[PDB]
Amino acid sequence: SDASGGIILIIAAILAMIMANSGATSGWYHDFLETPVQLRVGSLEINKNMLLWINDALMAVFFLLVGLEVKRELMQGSLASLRQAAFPVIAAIGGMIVPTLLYLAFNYADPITREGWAIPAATDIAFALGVLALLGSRVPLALKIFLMALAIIDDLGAIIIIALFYTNDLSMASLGVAAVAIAVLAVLNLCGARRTGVYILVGVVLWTAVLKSGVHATLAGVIVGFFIPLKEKHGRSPAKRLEHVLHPWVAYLILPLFAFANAGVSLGGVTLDGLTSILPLGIIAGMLIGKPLGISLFCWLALRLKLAHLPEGTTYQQIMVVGILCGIGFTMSIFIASLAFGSVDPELINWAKLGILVGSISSAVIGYSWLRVR
Amino acid sequence: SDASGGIILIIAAILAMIMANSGATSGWYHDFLETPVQLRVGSLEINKNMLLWINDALMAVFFLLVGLEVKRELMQGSLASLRQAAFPVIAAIGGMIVPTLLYLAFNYADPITREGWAIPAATDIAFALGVLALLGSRVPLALKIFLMALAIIDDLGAIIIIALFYTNDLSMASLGVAAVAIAVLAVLNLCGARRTGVYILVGVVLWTAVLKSGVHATLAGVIVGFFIPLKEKHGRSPAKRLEHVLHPWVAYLILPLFAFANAGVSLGGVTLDGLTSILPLGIIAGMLIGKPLGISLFCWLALRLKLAHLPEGTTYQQIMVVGILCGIGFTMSIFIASLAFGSVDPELINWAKLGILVGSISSAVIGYSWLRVRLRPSVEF
Numbered sequence: 001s002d003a004s005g006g007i008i009l010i011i012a013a014i015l016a017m018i019m020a021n022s023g024a025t026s027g028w029y030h031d032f033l034e035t036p037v038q039l040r041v042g043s044l045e046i047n048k049n050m051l052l053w054i055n056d057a058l059m060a061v062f063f064l065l066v067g068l069e070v071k072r073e074l075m076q077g078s079l080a081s082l083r084q085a086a087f088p089v090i091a092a093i094g095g096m097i098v099p100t101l102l103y104l105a106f107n108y109a110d111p112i113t114r115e116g117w118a119i120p121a122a123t124d125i126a127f128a129l130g131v132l133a134l135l136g137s138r139v140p141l142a143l144k145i146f147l148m149a150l151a152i153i154d155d156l157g158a159i160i161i162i163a164l165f166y167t168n169d170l171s172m173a174s175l176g177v178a179a180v181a182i183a184v185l186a187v188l189n190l191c192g193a194r195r196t197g198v199y200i201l202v203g204v205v206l207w208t209a210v211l212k213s214g215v216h217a218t219l220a221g222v223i224v225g226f227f228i229p230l231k232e233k234h235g236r237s238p239a240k241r242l243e244h245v246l247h248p249w250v251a252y253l254i255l256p257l258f259a260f261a262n263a264g265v266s267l268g269g270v271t272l273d274g275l276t277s278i279l280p281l282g283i284i285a286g287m288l289i290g291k292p293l294g295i296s297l298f299c300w301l302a303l304r305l306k307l308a309h310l311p312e313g314t315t316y317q318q319i320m321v322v323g324i325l326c327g328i329g330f331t332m333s334i335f336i337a338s339l340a341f342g343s344v345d346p347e348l349i350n351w352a353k354l355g356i357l358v359g360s361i362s363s364a365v366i367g368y369s370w371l372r373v374r
Numbered sequence: 375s376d377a378s379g380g381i382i383l384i385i386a387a388i389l390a391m392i393m394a395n396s397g398a399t400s401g402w403y404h405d406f407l408e409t410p411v412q413l414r415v416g417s418l419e420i421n422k423n424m425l426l427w428i429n430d431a432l433m434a435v436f437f438l439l440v441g442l443e444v445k446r447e448l449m450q451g452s453l454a455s456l457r458q459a460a461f462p463v464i465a466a467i468g469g470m471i472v473p474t475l476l477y478l479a480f481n482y483a484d485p486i487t488r489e490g491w492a493i494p495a496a497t498d499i500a501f502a503l504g505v506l507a508l509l510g511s512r513v514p515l516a517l518k519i520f521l522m523a524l525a526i527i528d529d530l531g532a533i534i535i536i537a538l539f540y541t542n543d544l545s546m547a548s549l550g551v552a553a554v555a556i557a558v559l560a561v562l563n564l565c566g567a568r569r570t571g572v573y574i575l576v577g578v579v580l581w582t583a584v585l586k587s588g589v590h591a592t593l594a595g596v597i598v599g600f601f602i603p604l605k606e607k608h609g610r611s612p613a614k615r616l617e618h619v620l621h622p623w624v625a626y627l628i629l630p631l632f633a634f635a636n637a638g639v640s641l642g643g644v645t646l647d648g649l650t651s652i653l654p655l656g657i658i659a660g661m662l663i664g665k666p667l668g669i670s671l672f673c674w675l676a677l678r679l680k681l682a683h684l685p686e687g688t689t690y691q692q693i694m695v696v697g698i699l700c701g702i703g704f705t706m707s708i709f710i711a712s713l714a715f716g717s718v719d720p721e722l723i724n725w726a727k728l729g730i731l732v733g734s735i736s737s738a739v740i741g742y743s744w745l746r747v748r749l750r751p752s753v754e755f
Contacts, residue, residue, distance in 0.1 A: 035416040042409045050415075197623070249571070 005251035006130020009331070012256035013263040020264030029264060046211060051261060052342070056214055058258045059335060060207055060221040063159070065250050067225020068243040070152050075230060078145050078310070086307045087299075088146055091319075092153035094298025095326055096121040099290030106282030113279055116340040116352060118158040120286025122329035124360070125151035126255050131364050132325065135372065142313045147322050150295075155332050156222065162339060163215045170216065174209050178216075181206040185227040192229060196238040199228050214339050255331060262334045265353040279348060280355030287327040287359035288366075295323030317374050324367035330360040379625035380504025386630035387637040387704070394638030403638060420585060425635060426716070430588050432632045433709060434581055434595040437533070439624045441599020442617040444526055449604065452519055452684070460681045461673075462520060465693075466527035468672025469700055470495040473664030480656035486722070487653055490714040492532040493726060494660025496706035498734070499525035500629050502699045505738050512749035516687045521696050524669075529706055530596065536713060537589045544590070548583050552590075555580040559601040566603060570612040573602050588713055629705065636708045639727040653722060654729035661701045661733035662740075669697030691748045698741035704734040 019029045038047035048056075073079035078088060099120035107113050128147055132139055184202050193199075203224035210216040228239040275281060299319055309315040329336075337352035393403045412421035447453035452462060473494035481487050502521055506513055558576050577598035584590035604613045649655060673683070673693055683689040711726035
């Protein structure tokens, strides 16, 4: 059903552009998005934008799904054996190094915009598999597995690194409750409980605990995902089931809603044709050249260094085209930018949005054409 | 599994007495329970206690289940055919008039305390089916059906009436969003979507909408339940499945938690032996005498007026004892009181807590004893 998810996501995003551009609505849009939301429990005060609660919740859910999927892969999929997994793993850590270094060389010594290094290293899984299904039955399953693997390794990678990078903000209290929640998840797993709702509840406790950090509130859902039992011991599996239940939500609701909230950027406000500012052009360079070159190069080096490829997908032609398709960070990149530029500046977020819009919509159209003939 | 639900409920409530009495903890308990919680969306300012967000959530869920159940009954159970349902229904509207009138005649003309009329008219379904399950295989299923139907008709009844009674507080915006949400549930049913999470979501939107009224945020879950598709048309059913998923939660988590939060009352603070104040004794009389007499009398009158009884349960002996067992309002009576007195007084709530604690723990024990000697004994050899 990843065909309809793509079109509903693109309808949502385009509708968001229309929302944030046309004058009659583009005021309501922003006054809604930038509206202060704050909760007070006695002396406890948490305050964020509408956009920050929306983002933290939606990405919590999304990365709950990603957690489930990456576990499934790590134990029962393309990421289980050290043999099969080598090719996507190498293709990923090479598909992040090149985009980052091509954006950092393009962003030499700017302590503000340095921090957005993990922006080109994103890949909107939904939009990648969204354009990949537009080709239809001509598309092999090794390809869809490979791409859906790359997206996750890279995105979870970026989230993890950025999580380890900004720690200056988390209180000892929140860290304590976080630790005890994660502990409860662990003990609950090793004592083996089928009932998945409990894992979700404890999970929400963890989320609430680490709420003052978008990357940690996101990483919460991943922790929860990792800690839901997989084994078919029950006769049925709870993680597989929950993933199955999630997939249509996060595809028809969560992602299109996030896109509707975070992909809107004003062009009717300002569109200076000089998209050469180090964020737009550094990002575009990091995505349109960084992704395919990284993937392809590290795949040459992969093949040389004894490590073979994923069966019946032409390694020279199709793999590199997928490498281009990874150059559409669309939604995921928007989030990363909304993590690296949310606290620093309202206008760096928008030029990043523009830069990744250009870098995404182009690489999806460009990547499409080189693939419709293969 | 209502045998372990009962004991976990009583362990919860007893632990709540312990919590609310011993000096070393009963302060933390109250500063936790009365802690202000408020949410601000630009100009939107919504504030309650800990206890009110807790109560509204828990009762929303509980009555989501109750809604599902009362629907299933209303179309496929003992409330479906106008024939069968006659006996429980008649047994109910009398088991509510008598408690109320026994409490209002005992609370004549005190505008503060009048409003707590529907307090004896409650029955803690979990506690009743809890004590009833202590008697074991001696207990016929017609009896548990009967009681679980009585509790529901009386409680949903009181919640409906009380919902109609206080309307003064609802802003027009909240009612607008409410109505449009309800309408979404309707159209969603009539276009038939098996996916049940959607109904739940729109339900939450409705809940948030009417949140400034515990009775309406409670009745919201009942609306949601009433609007989830029932037919086995899918091959499977969404309502039955959901209800089945709820049954453990609402019995192991929701109810015991609610008890732990709302059943705690101080005795080591004050226990003036004169529980003769019109609330304690009014409620006591409304539950201990109002419930059994109402049920039994309306059942005499039911049997006379052509309307028979539910099969193989001794209508004279057991029905009336179930009538007493309806007289344990514990958890539900606490909620109704916490609705009728919360805004007006924090100490009328506590004397109601006392009065219904007395009225409950007495009729539970009294009702037990007249029932252990009306069941036929499972012999062993």
